[PDB]
Design a protein around this ligand. Structure first.
Ligand SMILES: OC[C@H]1O[C@@H](O)[C@H](O)[C@@H](O)[C@@H]1O
Ligand SMILES: OC[C@H]1O[C@@H](O)[C@H](O)[C@@H](O)[C@@H]1O
Ligand SMILES: [Ca+2]
Ligand SMILES: [Ca+2]
Lengths: 746, 749
């Protein structure tokens, strides 16, 4: 012999050949992507699926052998959520969540993570990861903030671009490359009340301004697939949104990649949005809008059939989709080699030592030290003789009390979309305990031999009940008394607090942003012992911390740091490493304070709620080191530019302290007068700079003029001639930014 | 002639004769509305202003004398904020705020308030009120929620239409009529963060869905002027927003009234929104967009003169604006009668007996009883001997002590709310209105309590002080142990504790949004302590807007929402607590449990994955429409009388109500429409009609309901309001709570 089974015939012909031998039930199924957990058998055979997701290792094998038993035997596309590591492979390297990786501000490192993940993923016979996420964290209430790279469009585009580069490798012929997905196109992250897939009150211009830039960048860099979001946007769900799918994605951007809906997007139009009366119309509408893959809407099988029967859609539309789908499978060589799982390769690469080393580096670089009264690094800092630290001169016997509900919780440390977070029914126990170092484990392994590490759960967070729902745990006096006694008997109290899976993720938005359960009572009682308290926040997203946390000696943000996270936290507290992370997201002081992202649009009357500052608790870009860096002399080198030039500048940094630092210099551009209202400033560039104690460096900086854009009326992204301001410094706080003027002429 | 002074000459000819004699500075000046507080001399003489606002009484007489000294002697328009009464006339009738009056759900009553206000205003020489407010209260953080009629487009249209009818009376010839203003067109109440005039991230469809309907109503009913909002909307401030001004207001609606900007809109485009490099270009854009009156941007005078000289705008665009302004003045007859203030007329009508009686009725009907474990009406309820005097001690309660506590229990300024007296916007009333005209909660209990009862008072908490910014700043007061202990001691020696809690002016209004919605200062500690005494506590909320109440308030005996009830509000609360009146009010707005719970307005758009926040219910603390009486009312037989209707038809229906208790009630029956399946995502339900029913104890009544099919619309994609054929549910009950609502379906083919 047949022509579609001939690797000498071009793709287009083998497509048309194969299409000609397919029924209409087999063409409809070729768009289908079904849940493998409801039976691989009926999905490959009765329905004629083109793809499977959520496929356990046994079902992966079973699917390949059910393919030999179909009539034409089209190779399946096997897709999995490999969100920060091979999420659901029992012994895989699990990395920090995307939010924790964003704090490294290190795209070369994030490339390495995506590549490491791809090597592990390809070994298990999965071709397609639903990753990276390009949503922008603009409402902290949203449950899925942990899955974003934060609140800046530019940083998100940098890190997601690096993820796509790493996953896909060299192309459709790389053995260890996989298909990436630009995920939740577009606007899914800012919906009413921060709720999951409520209405997005987002106009075309608002979408173009803060949501589309990351997607457009990966779209022109070769991201293989895009995934359509759940949410209705200005009344119209993305699945049937011709403006976004056609005029933008296919039209303005010229994107030739493949589209997959989100889970039951077609069905939800019936029973949840109530914009379709039945599954035949719903199927029909999704066909007209230009969908390729329909994810987990089984009724789309008979729905799209009943709909071509009753003439609601022609057969020639189904063909257009099946054409782009089979084109992809043919371009991967899947009819030649279906990329079966190779057990020998699994044993060679999965959880390899060099993957663990990548994971440790991200962990170490992602921790953000937020406050520090000088208690850290503990006891002045430690050296090693890896290996155990030596006790410092004059600190022979110290006790570190590690307390709080997240101190030894390795499930919460891995976060959502990993292990037993719930989307895979084949890991009820999650990942092997030995692969994860909790905060407790980290101090126990690295403390000097004359030191002691004690442990006390000090608070619970919650229990489940029916009204199903989270019941916050009361403060529990015996539990707190025990943690207090441990702190009263120690030199340092390390309180590990945060959230956990029932307060994170899909359907689990939160309204208060506060520590649920006994944690606030715990923190109050720990701080009142007078033992210095380091608050380590292991949580999916930024939380409102209580006053006692701002009275504590130090605060470390760890954002679900993954499998080596506890090692990094212990190294940071002991001074075995220097802090390097910077916030990719602002921390609100109160849920009502929002919006707290740094790029707020000008215009407000006043600067202040009558009852509350508008200053965020912690701002985008901020983070401490163990030294002090002085910023001085920002000079724009030639202040006049045309629309294709580059703004070049210099700033001088001085390490005026006693320890080395890797500083992250941040470059913001402010457009002084704009035709339409615009952000007060936007991040456009950054540079990491290594500085030895006492070393001073003059640093070259650099922003393309073609990036100093806004979206005007009509909706064009243009550079507008006028005065500009360059703002350079260690964070987004205005009292930390040097500034210098420049101008763009026509 | 001169023909412009000839009332025999048709108006358009008089306009055109006067326009032709005007210099360019005189024409630009006619577009200025200047702040009379800054000096009435330069405004009228040097700047040739067409209008003044915030004009003190001595400045009103001065303004007329100055007009006689100008070249053209064009009579001024004197405009004022008369927002719930003549706000800034030292002894005028101050009614409840708009949020207070909305709880009455009574447009005929609201029309009488506006009429009474208009009679008082017109006696003082003011021609034009910047009222009513049509904004929709959709973010409770917003500082101006008290200026709205709540969160429902339909109720806002009803009451805003009543205000416009009352103010304007018989029209331009009516001596007690005044111009109304449809204020903050449009989208000003839902901006980022609930902040004052941040970005409104409002698309065209959303603006049409929830914000435009009440503006469209009063525009076709003849509202004389529209005020353009501060805020930038999808990048473009209303002031220069061609889609809103031309395509909608003057295109689709054919609106022919006069436009006025909000305060310094034009200049704000330079120094605040940063969309204009200088005032010349800001003035030019404002003229190009089609503005008429430019409020309090005095630099518009030079800027527009430079803009014409440099050729940025054509002089004929100025002429167009001056034509519309002059036409209004001619049609009002200001060139024949400029409507001088009248001292004899002031004495006749201001703070009159019949105006205080309208005030009393609004106040009584506005209180909302939200919770009640049976403690109310206190001691079983009282009677009067004398529909005015003290109540008599009832059977079984000869001696009772009432302890009136709380920061707002005796504070006349807070009870009147923003936009009244000493609220800040007028500088000639330093002590506000005369103390004796306002009955505080305390005053009311002291006047109504039977002879053998005693009324005590303890301030129990402070709310705030002011301080300089930790770079003018609200500093929440600490809980004060002595002051708490004094209110605790008063409560322990009492039968009932009436805790009057809320906010005050520094936590309310322009530039004064709130993030937490909680009671500020020592109020929470005071409530905790009071509830723990064992004496039953009635929590009375005198505040501008719905506050999140602490747990102790939900454990108290009863909770009463009063929303700044005006000068008689304390009489009303005392009467309510004593059972001298029945509760009638119903919430025009929902109460959130936490700022992070929003949105909590009843008409939320479908689509959410899940029902609740993982840490918190989405159920509001109190919902749109609810409110208790002192009796019980059953809703029984909801029946749609014929379920087939077409585009011109009327859905009719019956429901049966029974007063199964021992006490009379005026119940507010509420009618909601749900569009079961829509082409676009839409609200789960919307209020479309309501009706008040009187019921004596034991009485039943079958009640007829009608909703025009032409109101069961949605805004589709393409953005156009249409009834979509299909299935609908009719939901009828005493509130917007789904478990209080009978339902019946019907079809619109
Ligand atoms: O499992 C496949 C998909 O399930 C969905 O419900 C989530 O929104 C996506 O994040 C995910 O890729
Ligand atoms: O005072 C006149 C006007 O300017 C501003 O202070 C307010 O936004 C308006 O509501 C008011 O009508
Ligand atoms: Ca500019
Ligand atoms: Ca319908």
């Amino acid at each position: 012999t047949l022509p579609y089974l001939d690797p000498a015939v071009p793709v287009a012909d083998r497509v048309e050949d194969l299409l000609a031998r397919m029924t209409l039930p087999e063409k409809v199924g070729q768009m289908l992507q079904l849940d493998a957990r409801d039976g691989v058998g009926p999905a490959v055979l009765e329905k004629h699926a083109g793809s499977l997701l959520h496929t356990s290792p046994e079902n992966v094998l079973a699917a390949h052998e059910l393919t030999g038993r179909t009539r034409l035997r089209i190779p399946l596309l096997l897709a999995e959520d490999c969100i920060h590591g091979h999420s659901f492979w029992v012994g895989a390297t699990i990395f920090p969540t995307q939010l924790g990786m964003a704090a490294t501000w290190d795209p070369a490192l994030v490339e390495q993570v995506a590549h490491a993940t791809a090597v592990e993923v390809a070994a298990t016979g999965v071709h397609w990861t639903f990753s990276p996420v390009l949503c922008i964290a603009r409402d902290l209430r949203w449950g899925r903030v942990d899955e974003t790279f934060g609140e800046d469009p530019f940083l998100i585009g940098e890190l997601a671009s690096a993820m796509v580069r790493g996953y896909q490798g060299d192309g459709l012929s790389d053995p260890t490359g996989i298909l990436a997905t630009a995920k939740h196109f577009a606007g899914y992250s800012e919906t009413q009340g921060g709720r999951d897939a409520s209405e997005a009150d987002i106009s075309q211009r608002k979408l173009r301004s803060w949501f589309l830039p990351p997607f457009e960048r990966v779209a022109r860099e070769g991201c293989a697939t895009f995934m359509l979001g759940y949410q209705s946007m200005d009344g119209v769900p993305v699945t049937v949104n011709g403006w976004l799918l056609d005029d933008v994605l296919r039209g303005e951007w010229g994107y030739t990649g493949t589209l997959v809906t989100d889970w039951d997007n077609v069905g939800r139009m019936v029973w949840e949005q109530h914009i379709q009366p039945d599954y035949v119309h719903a199927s029909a509408a999704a066909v007209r809008a230009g969908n390729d893959m329909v994810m987990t809407t089984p009724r789309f099988f008979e729905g799209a059939l009943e709909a071509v029967d009753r003439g609601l859609v022609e057969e020639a539309a189904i063909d257009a989709a099946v054409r782009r789908i089979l084109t992809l499978k043919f371009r991967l060589g899947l009819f030649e080699d279906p990329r079966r799982p190779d057990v020998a390769r699994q044993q060679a690469v999965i959880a390899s030592a060099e993957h663990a080393a990548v994971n440790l580096e991200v962990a170490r670089r992602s921790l953000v030290l937020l406050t520090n009264d000088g208690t850290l690094p503990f006891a002045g800092g430690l050296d090693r003789a890896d290996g155990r630290a030596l006790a410092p001169a004059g600190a022979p016997a110290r006790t570190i009390a590690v307390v709080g509900p997240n101190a030894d919780d390795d499930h919460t440390q891995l976060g959502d979309w990993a292990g037993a977070s719930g989307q895979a029914d084949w890991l009820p126990d999650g990942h092997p305990r030995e692969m994860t170092t909790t905060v407790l484990d980290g101090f126990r392994a690295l403390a000097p031999e004359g030191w002691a590490v004690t442990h006390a759960r000090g608070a619970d967070i919650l229990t489940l009940a029916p009204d199903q729902v989270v019941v916050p745990a009361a403060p529990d006096d015996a539990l707190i008394a025990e943690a207090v006694a441990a702190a009263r008997d120690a030199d340092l109290a390390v309180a590990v607090v945060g959230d956990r899976i029932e307060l994170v993720g899909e359907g689990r938005s939160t309204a208060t942003l506060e520590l649920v359960g006994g944690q606030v009572a715990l923190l109050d009682a720990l701080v009142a012992t007078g033992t210095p308290v380091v608050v380590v926040v292991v949580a999916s997203k930024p939380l409102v911390l209580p006053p006692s946390a701002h009275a504590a000696a130090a605060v470390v943000w760890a954002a679900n740091p993954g499998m080596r996270g506890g090692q990094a936290v212990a190294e940071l507290v002991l001074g075995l490493i220097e802090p390097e992370g910077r916030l990719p997201i602002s921390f609100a002081r109160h849920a009502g304070q929002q919006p707290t992202y740094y790029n707020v649009v000008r215009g407000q009357h006043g600067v202040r709620y009558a009852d509350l500052t508008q200053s965020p608790a912690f701002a985008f870009g901020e983070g401490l080191s163990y030294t002090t860096v002085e910023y001085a002399d920002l000079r724009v080198l030639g202040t006049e530019h045309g629309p294709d030039d580059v703004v070049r500048a210099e700033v001088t940094l001085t390490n005026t302290g006693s320890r080395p630092v890797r500083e992250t210099v941040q470059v913001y551009v402010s457009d002084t007068v704009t035709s339409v209202t615009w952000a007060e400033k936007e991040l456009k560039a950054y540079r990491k700079v290594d500085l030895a104690p006492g070393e001073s460096a003059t640093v070259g900086l650099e922003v393309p003029v073609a990036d100093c854009t806004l979206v005007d009326a009509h909706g064009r992204r243009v550079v507008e001639p006028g005065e500009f301001e360059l703002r350079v410094g260690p964070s987004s706080r205005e009292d930390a930014l040097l500034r210098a003027s420049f101008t763009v002429a026509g």
